[PDB]
Amino acid sequence: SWSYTGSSFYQPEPITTFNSRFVEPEVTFQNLSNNLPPPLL
Amino acid sequence: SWSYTGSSFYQPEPITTFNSRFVEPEVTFQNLSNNLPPPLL
Numbered sequence: 001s002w003s004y005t006g007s008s009f010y011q012p013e014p015i016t017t018f019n020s021r022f023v024e025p026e027v028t029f030q031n032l033s034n035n036l037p038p039p040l041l
Numbered sequence: 042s043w044s045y046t047g048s049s050f051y052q053p054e055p056i057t058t059f060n061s062r063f064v065e066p067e068v069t070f071q072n073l074s075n076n077l078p079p080p081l082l
């Protein structure tokens with residue numbers, strides 16, 4: 001389970017399309033299998 | 042055929058969604074007819 005938090009304040013939040021951006025894949029990113037966030041669903 | 046290249050280095054790459062942005066049309070853009078890139082296809 002992965003959550004988004006602010007840079008200057010710690011508060012775990014659900015991942016949404018309004019706080020993440022689509023980027024070109026890299027080999028360093030995690031390869032999630034289950035419990036994908038709604039941007040990834 | 043049009044390819045994308047970096048600003049500080051030269052490498053012809055295919056045009057994807059991740060290296061282009063959708064903008065308001067202008068008269069000084071190229072009006073392509075055939076062999077559209079995948080963002081325009």
Ligand SMILES: *[C@@H]1O[C@H](CO)[C@@H](O)[C@H](O)[C@H]1NC(C)=O
Pocket residue numbers: 026027028029030031
């Ligand atoms: C995810 O998979 C790709 C290709 O299968 C691999 O290159 C990448 O290292 C993987 N990411 C990991 C293991 O975090």
Ligand SMILES: *[C@@H]1O[C@H](CO)[C@@H](O)[C@H](O)[C@H]1NC(C)=O
Pocket residue numbers: 067068069070071072
């Ligand atoms: C592209 O098409 C527009 C019409 O939508 C035109 O105004 C413009 O002059 C054209 N530019 C060219 C031919 O590159």
